[PDB]
């Protein structure tokens, strides 16, 4: 009548409103920049004869900004793969061409959707 310690989930937390012995019921979230897919929620049943989970713990996946815009006369210093909650990207412009704008800019997520806080800057020679 006690079921399996929970376990962790990468980027996530695991809930326990009250103990994991038969009855309890643990719950799913992901961390802030993560959206879940799987069980939102765990029972601790008694399957056949045993003592153990309703379902298994959830995965969290990144939530993506998408690629960030390129600018003309001006580049990226040091593009990356993917970008997440938090990270930023840095533009710079050429050598004759003076930066009008938004030096860098940021992933912010929005409906579990990465998208950039604001417009690329431009770069005027």
């Known amino acids: 009548k006690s079921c399996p310690n929970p376990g962790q989930i990468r980027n996530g937390q695991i809930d326990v409103p009250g103990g994991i012995l038969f009855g309890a019921t643990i719950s799913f979230s992901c961390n802030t ?18 003592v153990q ?9 990144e939530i993506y900004c998408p690629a960030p815009p390129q600018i003309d006369n001006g580049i990226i210093q040091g ?45 005027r020679g």
């Not at 993560?34 to 004869?49: N, V």
């Not at 989970?53 to 969290?60: A, F, G, I, K, R």
């Open 33 to 50: 920049g993560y959206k879940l897919f799987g069980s939102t929620s765990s029972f601790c049943l008694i399957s056949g004869s045993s």
């Open 53 to 61: 989970w309703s379902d298994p713990l959830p995965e969290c996946r």
């Open 79 to 123: 593009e990356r793969d993917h970008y997440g909650y938090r990270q930023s990207v840095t533009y710079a412009c050429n050598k004759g061409f003076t930066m009008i704008g938004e030096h860098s800019i940021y992933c912010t997520v929005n409906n579990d959707e990465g998208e950039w806080s604001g417009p690329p800057p431009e770069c």
